[PDB]
Amino acid sequence: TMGVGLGFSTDVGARARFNWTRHWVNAEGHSLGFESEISAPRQNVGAWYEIPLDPPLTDKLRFTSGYQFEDLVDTESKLLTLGGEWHSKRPDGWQRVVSLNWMREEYKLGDDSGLSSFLMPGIGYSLLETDNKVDPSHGYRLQFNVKGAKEGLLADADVLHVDAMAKGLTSFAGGHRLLGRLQVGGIATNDYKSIPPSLRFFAGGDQSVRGYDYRTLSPENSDGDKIGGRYMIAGSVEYQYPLAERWRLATFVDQGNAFNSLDFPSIKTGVGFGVRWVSPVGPLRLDLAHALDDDGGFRLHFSMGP
């Protein structure tokens, strides 16, 4: 299968995606792959190899490697990664993923720098339940993921990173939709300074807290630079009114922040309204949001997501 993509976002700007899938390499049903995405603030390249186990569809190994450059707000990171995964799914729909990932990261947090490396195991569970694929009328997504590391065991620090997300949709009356969204993240450690950007948390953006620019909701250090938070929350509620076929009208309320203290979350609130269009290039969403907290102006968001 082949793929090329063009995109735009308020978050990262113009964007190009590429995919290369090779669906059968050998008699055991192995799959080969490549993918990349190029945007001004972020560029990455990736490869993957797949081996079907038994049952062929729900159990498999996927070996992967990757590179990602990221220059966002006041932090930069060159991230190199290798990994092995074992996917397995029970009839509920609960997908477990057992992973072993090694990574090396060159990073700049504010006015400093680092290079650190980790071999970290992770486990994930997912659940996805919807009615159909171009017109979903109700459904949900549950995602849970924990990874961790022990210093000495190829790690500059001890790490316990946890992230979880939940999406839900209901249609009621004559096609009136309600959309619900929650996301939480946390990392526990005894050496926060050795902890690179990829393991820290940021908030704000199209799919996070609308009304605020991408990854700007964050703790700052002594000198006033957004260096990344130990924790995050992001929640959103959206009402959609079907206005025409392929056209919906949404209004929303968002809340969220990235923060270092459970006692001072400093929750930010965004509100707004937008237009949704299921176009022949994808679900496009164009939003107008007024940030109510901090120093709030008005903001234009563009995105092409589910």
Ligand SMILES: [Pt+2]
């Ligand atoms: Pt999977």
Ligand SMILES: [Pt+2]
């Ligand atoms: Pt990692």
Ligand SMILES: [Pt+2]
């Ligand atoms: Pt998600």
Ligand SMILES: [Pt+2]
């Ligand atoms: Pt602007």
Ligand SMILES: [Pt+2]
């Ligand atoms: Pt896209």
